[PDB]
Amino acid sequence: GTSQWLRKTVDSAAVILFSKTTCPYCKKVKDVLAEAKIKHATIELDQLSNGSAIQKCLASFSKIETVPQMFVRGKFIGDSQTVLKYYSNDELAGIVNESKYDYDLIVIGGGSGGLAAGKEAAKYGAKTAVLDYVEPTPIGTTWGLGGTCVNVGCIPKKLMHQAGLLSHALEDAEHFGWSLDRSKISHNWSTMVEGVQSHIGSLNWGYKVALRDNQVTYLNAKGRLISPHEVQITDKNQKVSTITGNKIILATGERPKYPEIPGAVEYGITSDDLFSLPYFPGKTLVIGASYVALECAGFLASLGGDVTVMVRSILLRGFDQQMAEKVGDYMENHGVKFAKLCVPDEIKQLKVVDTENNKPGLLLVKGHYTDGKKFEEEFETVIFAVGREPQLSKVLCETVGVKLDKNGRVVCTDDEQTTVSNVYAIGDINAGKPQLTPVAIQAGRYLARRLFAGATELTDYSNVATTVFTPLEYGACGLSEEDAIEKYGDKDIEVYHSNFKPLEWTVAHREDNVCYMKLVCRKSDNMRVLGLHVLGPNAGEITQGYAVAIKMGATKADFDRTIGIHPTCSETFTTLHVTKKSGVSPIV
Amino acid sequence: GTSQWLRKTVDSAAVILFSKTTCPYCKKVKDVLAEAKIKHATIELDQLSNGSAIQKCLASFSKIETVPQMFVRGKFIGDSQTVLKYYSNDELAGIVNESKYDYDLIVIGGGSGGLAAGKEAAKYGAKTAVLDYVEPTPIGTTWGLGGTCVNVGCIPKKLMHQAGLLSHALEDAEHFGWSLDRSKISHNWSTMVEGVQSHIGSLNWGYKVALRDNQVTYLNAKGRLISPHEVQITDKNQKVSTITGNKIILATGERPKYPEIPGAVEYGITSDDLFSLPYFPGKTLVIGASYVALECAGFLASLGGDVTVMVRSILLRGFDQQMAEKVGDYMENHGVKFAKLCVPDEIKQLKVVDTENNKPGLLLVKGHYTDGKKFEEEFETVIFAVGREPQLSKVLCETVGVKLDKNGRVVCTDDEQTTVSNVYAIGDINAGKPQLTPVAIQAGRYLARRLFAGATELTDYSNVATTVFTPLEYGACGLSEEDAIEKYGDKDIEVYHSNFKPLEWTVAHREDNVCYMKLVCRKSDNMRVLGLHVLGPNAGEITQGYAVAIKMGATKADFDRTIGIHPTCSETFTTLHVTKKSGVSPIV
Ligand SMILES: Cc1cc2nc3c(=O)[nH]c(=O)nc-3n(C[C@H](O)[C@H](O)[C@H](O)COP(=O)(O)OP(=O)(O)OC[C@H]3O[C@@H](n4cnc5c(N)ncnc54)[C@H](O)[C@@H]3O)c2cc1C
Ligand SMILES: Cc1cc2nc3c(=O)[nH]c(=O)nc-3n(C[C@H](O)[C@H](O)[C@H](O)COP(=O)(O)OP(=O)(O)OC[C@H]3O[C@@H](n4cnc5c(N)ncnc54)[C@H](O)[C@@H]3O)c2cc1C
Ligand SMILES: CC(=O)N1CCC(NC2CC2)CC1
Ligand SMILES: CC(=O)N1CCC(NC2CC2)CC1
Numbered sequence A, B: 001g002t003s004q005w006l007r008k009t010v011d012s013a014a015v016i017l018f019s020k021t022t023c024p025y026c027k028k029v030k031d032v033l034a035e036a037k038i039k040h041a042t043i044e045l046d047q048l049s050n051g052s053a054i055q056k057c058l059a060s061f062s063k064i065e066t067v068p069q070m071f072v073r074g075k076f077i078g079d080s081q082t083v084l085k086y087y088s089n090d091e092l093a094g095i096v097n098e099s100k101y102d103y104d105l106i107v108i109g110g111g112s113g114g115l116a117a118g119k120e121a122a123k124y125g126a127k128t129a130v131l132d133y134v135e136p137t138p139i140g141t142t143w144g145l146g147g148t149c150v151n152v153g154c155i156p157k158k159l160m161h162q163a164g165l166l167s168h169a170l171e172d173a174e175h176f177g178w179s180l181d182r183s184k185i186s187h188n189w190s191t192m193v194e195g196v197q198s199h200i201g202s203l204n205w206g207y208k209v210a211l212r213d214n215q216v217t218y219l220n221a222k223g224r225l226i227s228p229h230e231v232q233i234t235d236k237n238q239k240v241s242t243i244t245g246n247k248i249i250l251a252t253g254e255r256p257k258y259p260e261i262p263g264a265v266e267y268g269i270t271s272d273d274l275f276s277l278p279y280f281p282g283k284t285l286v287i288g289a290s291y292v293a294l295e296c297a298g299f300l301a302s303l304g305g306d307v308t309v310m311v312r313s314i315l316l317r318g319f320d321q322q323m324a325e326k327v328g329d330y331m332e333n334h335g336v337k338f339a340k341l342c343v344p345d346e347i348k349q350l351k352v353v354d355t356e357n358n359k360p361g362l363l364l365v366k367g368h369y370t371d372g373k374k375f376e377e378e379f380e381t382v383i384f385a386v387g388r389e390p391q392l393s394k395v396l397c398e399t400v401g402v403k404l405d406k407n408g409r410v411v412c413t414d415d416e417q418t419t420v421s422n423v424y425a426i427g428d429i430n431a432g433k434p435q436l437t438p439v440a441i442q443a444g445r446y447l448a449r450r451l452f453a454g455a456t457e458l459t460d461y462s463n464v465a466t467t468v469f470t471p472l473e474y475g476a477c478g479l480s481e482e483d484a485i486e487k488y489g490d491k492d493i494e495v496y497h498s499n500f501k502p503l504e505w506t507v508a509h510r511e512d513n514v515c516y517m518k519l520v521c522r523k524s525d526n527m528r529v530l531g532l533h534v535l536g537p538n539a540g541e542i543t544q545g546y547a548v549a550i551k552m553g554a555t556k557a558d559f560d561r562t563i564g565i566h567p568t569c570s571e572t573f574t575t576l577h578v579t580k581k582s583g584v585s586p587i588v
């Protein structure tokens, strides 16, 4: 079945040239298309295994078997002589631009996955439009091009994390001989926000420049898919029009949820608001226990804030719960307060936010615990981090026929196709996929190569590593301990673990046995590493490289025969030997 | 095959029990040995592929074929009934202690490898002595148990590096909103030295406690091997004596070299003296260009010093030379001066060191460039970092028969055996091996297991990752680019590379295109990764995990299908695409 690959490739591509590396008649067609500023995909057949059979099947469209052969939007155009005839007759530009729709591709959503898909497709001659719009938050916050990660997620989160880490660096520097006095140093919230927002502005602008230089049309517009090939767009002044595209990629992401309780929307905020907030939050309550809740609470305390987290049930639901508890214990020991097994009932306003003097307001939070006892306390800022959800009713007409699941996410095949054959979805709205920025980028780039350059590589969504940037960071790749035990049984699981202490913490007089790591392994499969977990500084840097080994099937013997780099935190993975079944302590 | 292994295992093990997991009489013997504090190896025949063959071969030694069987130093002792008889009759202790020699093992040298070998051997019942001595430096410097890395190597070097890193952390903190003024903060050298030396002292003590708790005899003595089984030991008071051992492990390491020029030994120092120097070096000249030279020049400059490095020919000979040059370019941009193609001719004393007032002296350094021009300049401190060498003529009487190579290192088989069948060598003095602390530890532990516990695993010295802790760190694993081209030819080698900027450097306004990473791959072996190189922060944490993947045979495709962790520096390895042959720019 090489024939049905070739048919799908020729059908879907915009401009594609079948070529060979040594053929100089091919080279003359290349240099002609380059000078004409015509972009295209190229399939070198001497570099593919079965390029012989493909050459034969090209005759089914073109009635010739030689190379080069040029196609445009499913139609054969000519061999060398015919393409040069079109060029010197000035007929070539009209032929490549002839299309049944306005665009080969329309991307709805200009974030991590959408921008990456659109730029990749434009590399192969696909005429591309990228639509993006930011619906404002209840208090009116808005931002520029690039999506959740760039503006209100990974980028400003980690910069603010770094600002918190530097407070411990100032304390540490005294013990290492520097003459500063940490107790006499304080933090300016608005200076930090100005620097963070200035970096984000350079990224908004770089993405506009990127799209321009790839000949991608950027429309700042709210998109709505009304039929398989029609997208209705609405302007900043409410002007409405319609554009048409061959392929459609949905990549509109999610926004934060609010609890259905009085006062929440009126008087609370979310992470959408926190990263450009013009005043220090002050005494803050963070409601929820996701990674967003814990990351935000953690740097606020490190910047000297008075911080409480209200937890309905457990921390980091879905992550390894031994690890989650070590994360929260570290936080509790370094100034974050927890109200456990608790839930909010209402937010009362006591003092309006003072815009002129750059001051928070004042709120009264009422709630109750699972036993029945009551919660009541005042806070200057209340931040909700109780999940995120898509809003596809605003994007999709029911009549088009794109199937959603019961959470509102799009049901896709393993190549991102929806139930409507020309419509695909990527990123956080793809049901069941990990909701991470590098996943959405890989999904979008690989999809664009399949649609417009005849690629076959799929995205692999298994064993994707994560890092939670709490004050002590937590990296992971693979199964939690409890998920492995439940899948294979407790007698088939072996766990190797150890505490450790970074060398940097010795002269600084930090704790001896808080950093921690383990390997969860399958006995009956040669001690296969099923999950890796580490709590310590620089956990993202530590974890990333092991994700390649786990993808490759690493076993415990693979970790053992590798030698460590000394002195590092990471090298402790190369000499693990204490098992949980042995009952031997893991302390250093 | 099996029979030669069994003969080897029985002959050299001190106390060993042959057993099966489900064998109630074996359990009877284990309990008696545990109750009598008799340490021993154990081989569970049911856990071995060919335990059936082994069980039959045991009769060639004991004339029985059941388990348990207990041996001591090559002699069958009995089954369960016979062992209990010796126990009940108060005869067991003297049986398990009977030996032709004072010790089952004598380790000459108490550093990284030797301490690890000694402790591991004692775990299996081997009666063990560890000998350690520290020959003072020319000005009298000395230190405690633990070797080069612990006292005058990796540990104090990386602590001082960390002190240097904190100066940039103090600068960065302003930009992230903290109120300090970096320009009014200074560094106190003796305060840092006191904290470093306190940590080292806790490690000196920890090793003495560990050897005690493992029943290893520690002798603070200079050792000399005068025949295959006799070690002469000389006292702190010059008392001489002789001990005997069955097996000998040489683990005496190396010391710094001095160039043969007037004034070098009298008025200069080495790294052996630097890590406990009671005064700040002041204006300093580092002579040499190894990683020791550049790491020391590096943190001295970050701590406010006026620093010059005098380079005979190139930086970091034997490392990838493109990366070496980026390392040195970064140092030159951040204050380190270089005198290139230059060599020293003599050191003259202008001032004597002032021990009382705690101040360096003053020196005049004279030398010449390779074209004949003259070098002449004054310095307060001159550090020689021009290599290290063993001193085995002090350890190894000629008549013993242990063969050395032309550099004076010990020629060993792949199981660390020397030319004398009961004598082994590990660590820096094993010719041709990487000279690193984790390698010496792996070699010593693995060897002890083969000698006293029947193990067969050998140490793997290939593709061992390294990290150079210059102000911008350089991590690596596998071949340099020039080595790969030399070995396979330029047309079979593809290099993927990219610049990157750490997110933490954005708000701090640090350099855009200084950090750098590349993968060196072999086209004809499925784009196998031959070498990985990265220059940036936390380079050792970044690199370690990739070393497991390389050990496993990772290819470029394995790096592409792995998803990144965002935002990290390390994730840049998972999306590399610009090749050096393309000529496309690697900047961002
Ligand atoms: C606080 C926080 C921290 C995070 N930290 C990390 C982290 O450290 N690492 C990590 O890997 N991930 C992190 N994430 C997750 C990451 O941000 C997302 O997985 C990623 O942004 C998803 O990208 P996307 O392309 O699917 O959608 P998005 O990046 O959300 O972009 C979709 C865009 O489409 C727009 N849009 C919506 N509807 C329409 C419409 N009708 N018309 C036009 N445009 C529309 C949206 O306004 C938005 O601009 C974090 C998320 C949050 C909230
Ligand atoms: C400045 C510096 C920095 C380094 N940094 C790193 C780093 O970051 N990472 C890394 O992996 N490696 C590093 N190394 C290398 C590391 O220190 C060595 O590879 C390691 O210490 C060698 O271990 P060893 O057991 O072979 O010998 P050693 O650790 O040198 O121990 C040998 C011991 O035997 C003693 N001895 C000698 N002769 C006798 C005798 N006749 N009788 C009794 N005792 C004797 C010696 O005095 C010494 O105590 C560094 C080295 C230096 C010099
Ligand atoms: C609704 C509609 O007609 N559009 C909305 C997006 C706008 N983009 C401006 C031209 C750069 C204009 C087009
Ligand atoms: C609620 C609200 O103010 N918005 C809806 C209409 C939007 N028009 C998009 C920007 C082209 C602007 C945002």
Ligand SMILES: CC(=O)N1CCC(NC2CC2)CC1
Binding pocket: B218, B219, B220, B221, B233, B234, B235, B236, B238, B239, B240, B241
């Ligand atoms: C006989 C000799 O010269 N030795 C010197 C070193 C001594 N150390 C142990 C604690 C006494 C051991 C004896």
Ligand SMILES: CC(=O)N1CCC(NC2CC2)CC1
Binding pocket: B133, B134, B135, B136, B220, B221, B222, B234, B235, B236
């Ligand atoms: C065996 C031992 O501990 N010694 C102490 C110091 C050694 N060298 C100093 C320079 C004279 C000599 C012997």
